[PDB]
Amino acid sequence: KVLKIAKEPISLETPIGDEEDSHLGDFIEDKNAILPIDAAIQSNLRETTTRVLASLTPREERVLRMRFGIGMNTDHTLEEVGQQFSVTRERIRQIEAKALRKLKHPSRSRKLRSFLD
């Protein structure tokens, strides 16, 4: 581990060809910039989830969304989402398991079978 310790970071403005044009900084990729395709699957995963949740129970869909968070980013735990609906107990976990096993059929989970990859 001593060797291979980034001995000398090469300058990002170094030339790449026979001339001083198109330096290395213009050829480095981006491992953090969200590509537009990956954002497309994000928006559609927001649309494809709102459609699958529209078939569930209204209160059940609300508690399932609160379990993860579609509009609200505050991902609540089982008990936290439990207090918002009824007595915080295994009933919330039971309804969550029932909903999860609900949209696993070829009818509801049809457009999502090719979504998880």
Binding site: G25, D26, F27, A33, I34, L35, A40
Partner: protein, 103 residues
């Protein structure tokens, strides 16, 4: 024609400017230069220049928006401040200049 052909709707973008990379190395895009942007500037195609160098390449917050819009079906876009202008104002702000937007 094989080693010279190229087509990349959206490839890996750069870091200093958040622009699509150049050349056929990794899904590059044909750089739209000052002398090649003047062709549309002299033309009445200002919406293209308001989307080819504003929302197409250098808008990390607008590129994904325009791609989602094109995928949805509506050919509408929006791009106020490109990443090129952002990095330019950040570099100018690095010196003793007071480059700062208003109204």
């Amino acid at each position: 024609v094989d080693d010279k052909i190229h087509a990349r709707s959206i490839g890996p973008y750069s870091l200093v400017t958040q622009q699509p990379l150049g050349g056929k190395a990794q899904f590059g895009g044909q750089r739209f230069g000052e002398m090649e942007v003047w062709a549309l500037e002299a033309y009445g195609a200002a919406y293209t220049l308001q989307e080819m160098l504003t929302v197409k390449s250098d808008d990390v917050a607008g590129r994904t928006k325009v791609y989602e819009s094109i995928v949805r079906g509506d050919d509408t876009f929006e791009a106020g401040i490109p990443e090129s202008f952002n990095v330019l104002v950040k570099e100018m702000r690095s010196l003793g200049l007071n480059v700062e937007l208003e109204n």
